[PDB]
Structure formats: C-alpha cells, structure tokens
Amino acid sequence: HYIKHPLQNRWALWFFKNDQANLRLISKFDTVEDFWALYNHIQLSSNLMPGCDYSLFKDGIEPMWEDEKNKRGGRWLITLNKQQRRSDLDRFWLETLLCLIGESFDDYSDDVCGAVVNVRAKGDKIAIWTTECENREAVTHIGRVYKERLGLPPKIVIGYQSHADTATKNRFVV
Template sequence: MGEVEEVEKKNPLNLKWTLWYLKPNKGGDWESNLVPVTSVGTVEDFWALYNHIELPSNLIQGSDYSVFKDDIKPMWEDKANRNGGRWLMTFEKGARGATKLDNAWLEVLLCLIGEAFDDESDQVCGAVVNVRRVMTKISVWTANYDDKAANKKIGKIIKQRTGYSDPIYYERHVDTAERGSKNIAPWDSLE
C-alpha cells in the first residue's frame, strides 16, 4: 500500500500551464488552427508531456508550440498580452541549430514552470517556438512593455539560462502586429 501512495504523490507547480499547437494549415484562419493540447499543473505531468511530444527541431514547417499560463491564450489580442512584448531568439536550420534550438526550448520551459524570473515571474505570460522555412524562433512573452526593468531582467535570465550566444531582442506586440516587423529600441537588445 505504501508503494501506491508514493506513486500518487505529485509535486505541484505554482501555476498551471497550457501547451498549444499551431498546425500548419493553409485552409481556415489562424485562430482555428491553434489548438490547446493539454494543461499541466505538476512537475510529473510536465515531464510526461515533454517526453511524449516532438522536439521543436522535428516539427514541420509552419508549426508552433506555445506554452502559456493556463488562463492566457498565445495571441496578441489576449488581454494579458495586449500591452506586452517578447524577447526573441533565432536559430539556424541544420543539425547544429537543431541541438541549440531543442536545448534552449527546454531551458525556457523550465524557466517558465520553475518561475526562474524571481519577482518578475508574474510579468511572464508564456513562450512560443515558431518553426519556419528559413529559421526557427523562440520568444518569451511578457505582459507589460513599459516595465523596462522587469523586461531587461527577464531577458538577462533567458540569455544566461539558455546559453544563447547571439544578441536577443525585445519587441512590442503592437509593433509586430501593425507592421509585421521589429521595432527595436536601443535598450531592447542584450549582447
């Protein structure tokens, strides 16, 4: 009986997180192609999920994984994201880029569920990996673009924890949505 009790004990996370998958489908609109896969609220459930999904480097072109706090959708229009932005890392295609991508994605996920951003963890909404033809991107989304100190601290932690050697950039969601390109201010990059 003691063995059964041990198996049933799980280690809860402070927050519940939802994995979303964007399937590449030229028919239909973007939102209808975005599917919530499952939510996790324990360490064990996170690892069970992580060990049973494809690594980002194995996803087909046009796919996205998004992991967001349970009550936040991975879209600019969500009220939690509307005034925020994202830290952005890019990865080249090929074996070397795939290893860096997969390692960085795992580290970003561990930062999310482990609340590695200290007092700024409440600013973090989630993370996205976009698999595209030329390159793949990982972004960490924050709630408030104007909280520059919190965003800078989050960016430094991302860079340090992932070991990402290139500069990372921060961009406002509103600029990305309106122009489809970066609007990077001088404070918005970390070497």
C-alpha cells in the same frame, strides 16, 4: 500513494498550424511529474513540419497578441539559422519550458505570459512573451536571466519587440 510536486502555476501547451480553429490545446498540467509525462510523449520541435508552433502559456491566457494579458506586452526573440535546428533548437526550447514552469525570474515571474517556438523553412525562432513592454525593470531582468540560462556569449545581442510594433525595431536589447 505517490505525492506529485505542484508547480506555482497551471500551464497549457498549444499547437498552431497556418491556414481559433487553427489553434489546438495539447494538454494542461500543474505538477513536475505531469509536465515530464507530457514532454516524453509529444514530438520534438526539430521534427515538427515547417510553419508549425509549440507554445506554453499560463492557464487562462490564449497565446495571441489580442489576449488582454498580451495586448500591451512584447517578446524576447531568439533567432536560429538552418544549421542550429539539430544542435540548439530542442535544447533551447526545453530550457525555456523549464525557465517558465520553474518561475526563474524572481520578483518579475508574474510578467511572464508564456513562450513560443516557431518552426520555419528560412530560420527557427524561440520567444518568451511578457505582459507590459513599457516595464523597463521587469523586461530587462527577464531578458538577462533568460540569456544566461541559454548560455549565450555577452557579444550575442537579443532584442525585445512590442506586439504592437510586430503588428505592421526593439524597445530593449541585452
């Protein structure tokens, strides 16, 4: 009887550990209900073992540079210190999940490939991946919208790195 609320896209939640076989599908979902059903039955990012990643990517996109919708793409990086693990990490990740599945980037939502959270000893990272790092308009808008939704002061500056640059410096800042 109950009618689920469909999302604009099919999404896939992945888990990664350091040394294809290293990367595991957690679940896919295409409704608001099936998302919350997933979120409430998986471990928080703050409780993950160091050197492990969660990633949400649109259906058919592998969360890797060499994927053809990521190859010419880049990422908006958020860098967290050791103290922010308890206060901001889990909150900033859910805000990123909701941003993506909510199609919150107006004309430029199709540029978004997915988002990644890195759980590291030195300092945690959250990134939204887009598809074309030379698209100033699309990348700049997605950056401004993202920075607002996280609630960061204007003085705090975030950078956008090409995946080609990272595989060895930002292309944009906002």
